[PDB]
Structure formats: C-alpha cells, structure tokens
C-alpha cells in the first residue's frame, strides 16, 4: 500500500501515513477537497503524482480519467 503526506491549514507537513489511515480520515470527513496531499514515491506510477503536492480535488479529477463509463467500470470490478 502507498504512504502519503499532507499539509495542514497552517502549512505544517504531516506524515507519512498509510493509505488505510488516509482513507479512514477521508471517509470520516476530516479532509476538505482543498487539502494538499502527496504520495510518497515508493513505486513507479504513470499518473505523475509521486512526491508532489496537489489538492485532494485535483487528485480526484485525475483519477476520474480512468472511469470512462459505467459499462467498462462494471466489467473492471465484476467480470
């Protein structure tokens, strides 16, 4: 699993935190879409997000590109 850092409201960097920890906090409502996050570059990845800070909202927008339509998305999850 990945690890992540984030920048808080005052500018302080926190982490590394596992995907599990970040996911839990997100689902818990602790993170605004404006929050800056960074994925630690533990593995190569083609999205280009390793070690940079982008907003949560920007990360979500990037990930949406993979979900082109519900038919392919259904098959990718279920077939």
3-state secondary structure the chain: CCEEEEECCCCCEEEEEEHHHHHHHHHCCCCCCCCEEEECCCCCCCCCCECCCEEHHHHHHHHHCCCCCHHHHHHHHHC
The set of residues, in sequence order, having a beta carbon less than 8 Å from that of 60 and lying 6+ positions away, is 33
Method: X-ray
* Phi/psi of residue 16, nearest 5 degrees: -70, 150
Residues paired with residue 49 on neighbouring β-strands, in sequence order: none
Domains in the chain, ordered, with CATH? 1-79 (3.30.1490.40)
Tokens of residue 14, six digits: 């926190």
Cα separations in angstroms, 40 against 13, 19, 43, 64, 76: 13, 11, 8, 21, 26
Contact assessment for residue 20 and residue 9, using Cβ atoms and an 8 Å cutoff? no
The rounded distance, in Å, linking the Cα atoms of 60 and 13 is: 21
Query: For this experimental structure, what is the resolution in angstroms?
Result: 1.8
């Amino acid at each position: 699993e990945s690890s992540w850092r984030y920048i808080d409201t005052q500018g302080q960097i926190h982490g590394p935190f596992t995907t599990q920890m970040m996911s839990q906090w997100y689902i818990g409502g602790y993170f605004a879409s404006t929050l800056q996050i960074s994925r630690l570059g533990s593995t190569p990845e083609t999205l280009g997000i390793n070690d940079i800070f982008i907003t949560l909202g920007e990360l979500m927008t990037k990930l949406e590109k993979y979900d082109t339509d519900p038919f392919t998305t259904f098959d990718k999850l279920h077939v």
